Design an enzyme around this catalytic site. Structure first.
Site, PDB file in Angstrom:
ATOM      1  N   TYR A 130      -1.817  -0.665  10.512  1.00 37.68           N
ATOM      2  CA  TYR A 130      -1.802  -0.865   9.061  1.00 37.68           C
ATOM      3  C   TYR A 130      -0.523  -0.329   8.419  1.00 37.68           C
ATOM      4  O   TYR A 130       0.090  -0.996   7.585  1.00 37.68           O
ATOM      5  CB  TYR A 130      -3.020  -0.190   8.430  1.00 37.68           C
ATOM      6  CG  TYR A 130      -3.260  -0.542   6.977  1.00 37.68           C
ATOM      7  CD1 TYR A 130      -2.842   0.306   5.946  1.00 37.68           C
ATOM      8  CD2 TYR A 130      -3.908  -1.726   6.633  1.00 37.68           C
ATOM      9  CE1 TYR A 130      -3.069  -0.023   4.606  1.00 37.68           C
ATOM     10  CE2 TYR A 130      -4.138  -2.066   5.305  1.00 37.68           C
ATOM     11  CZ  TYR A 130      -3.719  -1.214   4.296  1.00 37.68           C
ATOM     12  OH  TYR A 130      -3.959  -1.566   2.981  1.00 37.68           O
TER      13      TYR A 130
ATOM     14  N   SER B 192       0.845  -1.186   0.000  1.00 34.67           N
ATOM     15  CA  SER B 192       0.000   0.000   0.000  1.00 34.67           C
ATOM     16  C   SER B 192       0.875   1.229   0.000  1.00 34.67           C
ATOM     17  O   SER B 192       2.071   1.147   0.274  1.00 34.67           O
ATOM     18  CB  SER B 192      -0.870   0.045   1.262  1.00 34.67           C
ATOM     19  OG  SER B 192      -1.529   1.299   1.391  1.00 34.67           O
TER      20      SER B 192
END
Ligand SMILES: C[As](C)(=O)[O-]
Ligand SMILES: C[As](C)(=O)[O-]
Ligand SMILES: C[As](C)(=O)[O-]
Ligand SMILES: C[As](C)(=O)[O-]
Ligand SMILES: [Mg+2]
Ligand SMILES: [Mg+2]
Ligand SMILES: [Mg+2]
Ligand SMILES: [Mg+2]
Lengths: 260, 260, 260, 260
Positions: D155, D142
């Protein structure tokens, strides 16, 4: 402290440059100032720094847009001070415009001062630093030497160039008592920026400080400006013995700019 | 200086962590030592530090592999010290093996101590720092938080996570008088590294110092070790007001490792 | 495929440039070749590419060291081809020497071709791309646009400059159907490199391939060269519709160079 | 093409993972689907994919939060498919909260699935890839593996770890016909994001598409979503021979997110 050492700081007659020169002088380092400006005003700054910190302070108005001039600035510094322990390449210029609207003359001037000037200055000082076995090359790049902003192609390109150049400088001097790093500042509250704020202050009809935060919101998470004093204290750290193994890297002073 | 401030340093009974706690204590900050080791020798270190710098020094042997234990370290530090201005998450462990040969147990242990500990410690400290209006979280990551080395998967992954976690910490605290940065060390001459140098010196039939340079050659251009005193000095800089706007970033102390 | 699109590739009469131009032609894209070289040999390449791939292939010997020339190359491409969908800024030159020994003339030439040329070319093509609502600016930078090597200051500086410039380009065109990225190649087996290998082949008295791996050992982990065909296939990907949201970034094709 | 190759994709019953498995299947590769979901609908997807592209497609509902289960997925894929040429570690989960409010349970769960799963999957696949002389490990990280966002600590940390883990994987396999890269997506229009758009559209009293641009404005310059088809196309490129020397790197597909 830095007693007995000599520091040359380009574009130090005001703002960031002067903040670093002042920070180094306070550590006991002799200083060679530089940059365009009012001869009389400049002398006042020089003499003021010399007196306030009890160190030798010189001023060389050498034009940084000229390679021979930059190299001359460094040579004469060594001739007058006896050596060059610290070289802070700070001088910078900018211009905002879309790439297709960017004037070639502006692009060339920006590359010349912000990038090429660092090369010439470094090239002139390296022989002296390698001979003495001590050196601290502190390049003042920018957050724009790591990331970009629309409409600032030349500045972003030049600053990235400085970071890359800083890395090479470090590798060629690795282990010789010399380090080369690049401080990458975020927003600093300059006089022109102050007018940018006042332009937003009367644009939204809000107090100056509110406008200040408005101006910082987009790029600077902390919503606080970086000061010349902080940048001076950062240069001071990198010049210290504790930073002996810090070389070929960047020190971002940007209130979180590059964290997101 | 840091007089009137309280600094907690995990894994500070020796080496890097100890060097950092010492540099901080040297600036007038009260200290909370932590980490597994010999009780007898730990007390000697704790007592010595307090006597040497005339600051309050405690020791908490909390098991950093335990989440509630890390939070407890912070909680107790506040209760006994009065506050927590500085949190240095330093403790770490390693293991070398190909990914397919890496024991799941080792993978889990490295992530728990090298990464999760930083989260638990940060979480417990933030409420106090936000209320105090002051905070300096300094995560001791590694060059391996920026680049990689073969056979060190769990360590590289965990350190990379630490750098990322540091960035989030900074953004969540931006502007609140709190900063969070990650120091990324290169080779440090630990006792275990010393054995490595001797082993190499024997295998190559060269003197200890020749082996040292040889061991450093692949990753560290300078061919010089980073010291606990240097890293301590780096932490001292980051905890200073000069670094008020340095947040969400990394400070590489690796002799040029990450420049190439 | 890229049928109906027009690609301009600088320094494509041979090596990497020709590999990309060939890769694009094979996708059905019309091509405008460029670079210095033998007029007769060049025509052979042009006609050969045109015939082999059934597309229109032109050659413009415009001198990339001149800004007006670069802009002219792009304008005439649009005049002859009817538009410019893809612009690959590839042309590059180098020179090895310590910073203090680096000739100013060499530094300036390297910046001019490797950096400034990208600006002029991009500036000339942007208006056309924004008008058509489609664009693919593919800058061929280098691993040296991300990290450095000792003795290559100008190249490293210029390439870093390109990466920064690529980022700005992307931001100014974001959402307009235009993307700008920089492929950063590691070692490629060029003719001059082949002679560098043969220089090591007779230096250690080993077969060519062994010398090849010797030459790659220091920077390229895979111990395998990147080929012009691979770089062509990479350019092809970035020009595809699947790369529509890939912009302002780099694609390292370096066998692990920048991973460590 | 990828005919004769076997690709395993975790979390591929829908969204990004499904888009990737489809693009791969579209190139002739046999597929192994995986991920939690509705058995009935999963079979429809599995059967449909096989019929559509005429390739063998299986589904393994292994619980990716379990280390032995991830390895079992790979093990069974080899047994049923004959080999494993491509491993796409895609599955992920998120949670938003300030660090001090982040549930330890959520922190542990995000790290287990988003990071540890990549390790277990990679470890089980490597022995087969090294023996086959071919391998493509593609980790779906990501933009949050490169930069950070407030309130997404677990995350960001996990994704950062994935990027680091990817680099080590590449170095340990360099030259063995195997590459390992991390695709770093920006905003993707998932069903849950759709709800986010509607909610925002309601709160701001604007049309769905105006809200979409508004939601994307802070992080994605293009103001356009990245698609599963694009990411699939990206994976297809990385698994191609053109990307043989692309290893240990990141491929950002974020509409300019990481450029500024
Ligand atoms: C963010 As700039 C200081 O380098 O103007
Ligand atoms: C390179 As290290 C000091 O993190 O092991
Ligand atoms: C590594 As270079 C290709 O850009 O010569
Ligand atoms: C920014 As994302 C698609 O990793 O949630
Ligand atoms: Mg006057
Ligand atoms: Mg004992
Ligand atoms: Mg001829
Ligand atoms: Mg059902």
């Amino acid at each position: 402290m830095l007693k007995g050492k000599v520091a040359v700081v380009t574009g130090s007659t005001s703002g960031i440059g002067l903040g670093i020169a002042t920070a180094l002088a306070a550590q006991g380092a002799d200083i060679v100032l530089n940059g365009f400006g009012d001869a009389a005003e400049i002398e006042k700054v020089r003499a003021g720094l010399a007196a306030q910190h009890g160190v030798k302070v010189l001023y060389d108005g050498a034009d940084l847009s000229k390679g021979e001039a930059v190299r001359g600035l460094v040579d004469n510094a060594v001739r007058q001070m006896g050596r060059i322990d610290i070289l802070v390449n700070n001088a910078g210029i900018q211009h905002t415009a879309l790439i297709e609207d960017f004037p070639t003359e502006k692009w060339d001037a920006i590359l010349a001062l912000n990038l090429s000037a660092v090369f010439h200055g470094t090239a002139a000082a390296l022989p002296h630093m390698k001979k003495q076995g001590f050196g601290r090359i502190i390049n003042i790049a920018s957050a724009h030497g790591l990331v970009a902003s629309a409409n600032k192609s030349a500045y972003v390109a030049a600053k990235h160039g400085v970071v890359g150049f800083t890395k090479v400088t470090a590798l060629e001097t690795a282990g010789q008592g010399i380090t080369a790093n690049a401080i990458c500042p975020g927003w600093v509250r300059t006089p022109l920026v102050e007018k940018q704020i006042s332009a937003l202050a009367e644009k939204n009809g809000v107090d100056q400080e509110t406008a200040a935060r408005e101006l910082l919101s987009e790029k600077q998470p902390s919503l606080q400006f970086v000061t010349p004093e902080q940048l001076g204290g950062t240069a001071v750290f990198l010049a210290s013995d504790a930073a002996a193994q810090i070389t070929g890297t960047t020190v971002s002073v940007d209130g979180g700019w590059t964290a997101r």
